[PDB]
């Protein structure tokens, strides 16, 4: 699986937009959306939000968790804990990239938000590195990774799974 | 392309033609009419339309029925992604932005 | 002015309503006014250099209206941008008599109004022809307009012990000139001040006081004032409060901006409009009786606007009246069922008095079910009396 | 006809249609093309974009594309000629013309059905009335009317000049559509600055248009920012600047910019052996250390950069340079990216007029057009490097011409020519760079000479075009004066001289004051021009 | 099954087929339902007018859904081409009522692919071989899927006493409980019935 595909799944997440156009309810296959009333918030999937923002048809509102105080608390909790902590969104990195790259004008203090999300990303990838090293050193049979996100797993998981396949075959080659 | 086709054996071309016929038969059989061209949509879709630039001096390209675009070199068109995907993959067109 | 924020700010909203937003600012880079619209199909965003230092503004589908206080060298001036005009001379400017000072302005369908320091109200066409002039009963606090209606509030006297002594004057500037309210006292909560005035999108006058109680003109109850929402109960914490920008009756929406520890929102980062549901202040409201009756009265007082539009000749969809009557009647049928099972048949007759006899026949059949004989007989007598009147 | 409202009777028409953009190879045309591209991409308009740089190329492209497209938009081309005569279209086609060239041809003005002009009607236009241009004593009256017609048409068509920027027109349309982005405003600014850099407009008109764009900059800044809380550093921030006239001084050393700015180079005579000493007088008056002046500007001491503009202005005033400061704009985004509008103009122009013999001029156009987007910032920096090379070559050519005295009076106009094989004649073979070189060279000449009459003359300049075809490009420049209207007659003068001489002139360029001649024809052509200007 | 949950099940199958080492059991109902949904929506937009925002939004959702379907079928075809003799032998061996790893279209494609490959090898080299060596069985030549591959997963229905088998030493074995919403990294051979029954989602 590619990072673009993980972004494709991340684009299904719901975000709130303020349209500058009028449109009645539209019945999409994945779920009806709207009605789109000018100047009023409406919740839509992230791909449609980014598309309308690109076409100058709405203002994006940040999610409730894109807040400097909340993100600082989450970052400090992540650095304080040893296990992966529950993240505000299951696709927080991709949400941050899309929303801040396309709507930094709408989202206040986007620099702080981006830096805090990067801090959490660095901490959690370091934790994943430690988990992989502990797995291979202790010859564990399985691991528990409850609060990892899909992008975090996808970044390093192909290498880790291939290495563990090799390790399993090496430790089991005396089967008779 | 012929520079690559020159590397293949005749029996390799036989196998390739049989594989192409089998693949097209399978693709047709996926739906009631016109099947599903699974060779398209190789990357996840980002935008409904894209801007493309002609790398090769090339012939007329039909967009829809009486509408068509001349693919002269360095001319730049804004067209549907699903129509331009094959030519981009073949290198006739360059996706920009 | 409704939807404004205070003049002392460096960068403020001059008006926020259902149409759009006007902002004004004064800084070392420029003195200017930014006009923008919620629906960009109406008109493009407009920008004006604020050399004349306009301070009061109003926005409509038809025009932008601006006004300034008088200085020593230049009088108070009324300025307009009738962008919806077909002619190219979309701008017009008017200069008031010497040391006369505009203190409030508002817009309507094809006309503009200005209240001045002479306790004088001046009417203008939206193209800037001076229409009639008359004297206000006191110093104004604010004005509003919708269609032919002109809604004015003023100081009818001096308040005591925290209260404000406000009177309301509601003109109709239609084919025949009228005064629906001609200086009536305006209700307020104790120790409050008037925070917001205007009309529903459906054209009913409404206002909100500094304790967050929303009131609407009840045209089905002799043009009295009915509360329809307490915004304080809807807040995350009672220190905070909402800042209203618009009202809609169908769908039932109260459009407002929540404010964190402030009477009004900051100009940036740009606020998001929240939707609040209207709530009549009825007793035992959590009970099924309370739920049903409060919904019934909420429905009918909102659907009074259909009667006003039809009476004054404005077009409307008959499906709205059909839906209103159907909702009210099915609701009151369910309420009749509850009162029937409670065996208060006089209460059933009182409830069914509000209904059409065709619908009362269903309650008669419901009373026949389980053999509530006296209830069925008295609902039949009520239906016979209604038919006799009809 | 003139379009009265771009929104209703141009944009909402083509919004429902397939469109073909023909775009001239000049920076204003590129910026207008970028703005219109962004609008069309917002609204999913299926456009096709074709570069052109001459009438033969436009005719070839139209002949290739006439069958498929009915709606055409010509950017910075087509207004000053009869498009119906040149192109021979079908009557159901429509040509929109957003062209800065003036005067508009009367056929294009009064063609109601087919030619629609995206030109402001409040521009400086003096179109003659219809009855003066279109249809025994009655025969005598008719002949008198024809004499009136030829006289008034010559008075109308004598001087060519440039109106409001096409990029500004397209940004006005974007603003009316309420789809104006900050980058669109930057493209509008760069389009105006192209006209100012190439001296296509008067200083008064440039100041007026900068006054127009100041309001848009203020609106865009206050759209989402104030003095209390601000945007991310990533966001583009356009700021009005009362900045220095020196070229590319924020990406160079200040010594190089004082060396290669046409203004200061012409004033101090830096082509001459004495000019470096005059420059040292200027620098010593400012008190800037030479080791700092010859260091790159980004590495210069911030104590010197604190008030450099006031220092340069107040020293320039007493050294006689009266207008060193200019009203302009800059764009900032990210931490380290900072450009002036003149910088983007020079970079894009150098990319487009690059001397590399790779691919085609359309390829160089494509590199220039890509560089105007922030996703291709590397191309912009590469264009700045090419601008360094271009400006150095320009000063070398000016020094060669003035030292060897190639610039010579021939009566009513000065004449100059570049010989084959001389250093960096290849860079100025292309007509646009040649026109820019001729303007800079004339400024240097009139600053150099003591002859007050010679300061008032226009310039005619020639350079090789194709040795295999034996042809030369020729350009005509009006007199370089502080109060010039930037109107020139050399289009009609070249045409009438060529006709009176039966010369082999190919009139392929969009400016009428730029032509191609068969080389041996030049002697009788120049003699005809001398006899004509008298 | 409402269409939103149909698309959700499609994406579940897409992920599971991405990360499973073997070819998973076919989902012909999902494929046919998504195909008819796409046909119906394309017909509706064909009836609708151009320069319309809702048409463009519906087209974008159609592009996303068709991308998921095309990628899922492409991955299944990759697995078929990679393990054609083994999937064909599995279909031959399949008991009645056991779900098939191949749709009828996929089975026809697999048979054609195997026949084409065998004929190619025959004609090119294997008729030129010595007489005893002219036959080679692709059931032995082509490798099998590696069911011991490690996979990430996220569970959707709680499980208990799932046996974790570290290596050939039986006495190192232990058992775990997969709590709802937890994520694990484990060999595929220990969780094949779970993913087949939908108790777990591979990630």
Swiss-Prot record, chain B:
It is found in: Nucleus; Chromosome. Induction: Significantly up-regulated in aggressive melanomas. It comes from the Eukaryota. Component of the GINS complex which is a heterotetramer of GINS1, GINS2, GINS3 and GINS4. Forms a stable subcomplex with GINS4. GINS complex interacts with DNA primase in vitro. Component of the CMG helicase complex, a hexameric ring of related MCM2-7 subunits stabilized by CDC45 and the tetrameric GINS complex. Required for correct functioning of the GINS complex, a complex that plays an essential role in the initiation of DNA replication, and progression of DNA replication forks. GINS complex is a core component of CDC45-MCM-GINS (CMG) helicase, the molecular machine that unwinds template DNA during replication, and around which the replisome is built. It is linked to Immunodeficiency 55: An autosomal recessive primary immunodeficiency characterized by chronic neutropenia, natural killer cell deficiency, recurrent viral and bacterial infections, and intrauterine growth retardation. Postnatal growth retardation is present in most patients. Belongs to the GINS1/PSF1 family. This is DNA replication complex GINS protein PSF1. It comes from Homo sapiens (Human). The chain holds residues 99 to 195 of 196 of the full protein.
Curated annotation (Swiss-Prot), chain C:
It comes from Homo sapiens. The modification N6-acetyllysine is found at residue 238. Core replisome component that acts as a replication initiation factor. Binds directly to the CMG complex and functions as a hub to recruit additional proteins to the replication fork. It is found in: Nucleus, Nucleoplasm. The lineage of its organism: Eukaryota, Metazoa, Chordata, Craniata, Vertebrata. Trimer. Interacts with the polymerase alpha catalytic subunit POLA1. Interacts with MCM10. Interacts with DNA2. Interacts with CDC45 and GINS2 subunit of GINS complex; these interactions associate WDHD1 with the CMG helicase complex. This is WD repeat and HMG-box DNA-binding protein 1.
Swiss-Prot record, chain D:
Belongs to the CDC45 family. It is linked to Meier-Gorlin syndrome 7: A form of Meier-Gorlin syndrome, a syndrome characterized by bilateral microtia, aplasia/hypoplasia of the patellae, and severe intrauterine and postnatal growth retardation with short stature and poor weight gain. Additional clinical findings include anomalies of cranial sutures, microcephaly, apparently low-set and simple ears, microstomia, full lips, highly arched or cleft palate, micrognathia, genitourinary tract anomalies, and various skeletal anomalies. Required for initiation of chromosomal DNA replication. Core component of CDC45-MCM-GINS (CMG) helicase, the molecular machine that unwinds template DNA during replication, and around which the replisome is built. One of its GO terms (cellular component) is DNA replication preinitiation complex. The keyword Transmembrane helix does not apply. GO terms for molecular function: chromatin binding; DNA replication origin binding; single-stranded DNA binding. Widely expressed, highest levels are found in adult testis and thymus and in fetal liver. Component of the CMG helicase complex, a hexameric ring of related MCM2-7 subunits stabilized by CDC45 and the tetrameric GINS complex. Associated with ORC2. Interacts with HELB. This is Cell division control protein 45 homolog. It comes from Homo sapiens. It comes from the Eukaryota. The modification Phosphotyrosine is found at residue 130. Its main location: nucleus. It is found in: Nucleus; Chromosome. It holds the Pfam family CDC45.
Swiss-Prot record, chain E:
It holds the Pfam family SLD5_C. Induction: Significantly up-regulated in aggressive melanomas. This is DNA replication complex GINS protein SLD5. Keywords: Acetylation, Chromosome, Cytoplasm, DNA replication, Nucleus, Phosphoprotein. The keyword Acetylation applies. It comes from the Eukaryota. Belongs to the GINS4/SLD5 family. Required for correct functioning of the GINS complex, a complex that plays an essential role in the initiation of DNA replication, and progression of DNA replication forks. GINS complex is a core component of CDC45-MCM-GINS (CMG) helicase, the molecular machine that unwinds template DNA during replication, and around which the replisome is built. Component of the GINS complex which is a heterotetramer of GINS1, GINS2, GINS3 and GINS4. Forms a stable subcomplex with GINS1. GINS complex interacts with DNA primase in vitro. Component of the CMG helicase complex, a hexameric ring of related MCM2-7 subunits stabilized by CDC45 and the tetrameric GINS complex. One of its GO terms (cellular component) is nucleus. It is found in: Nucleus; Chromosome; Cytoplasm.
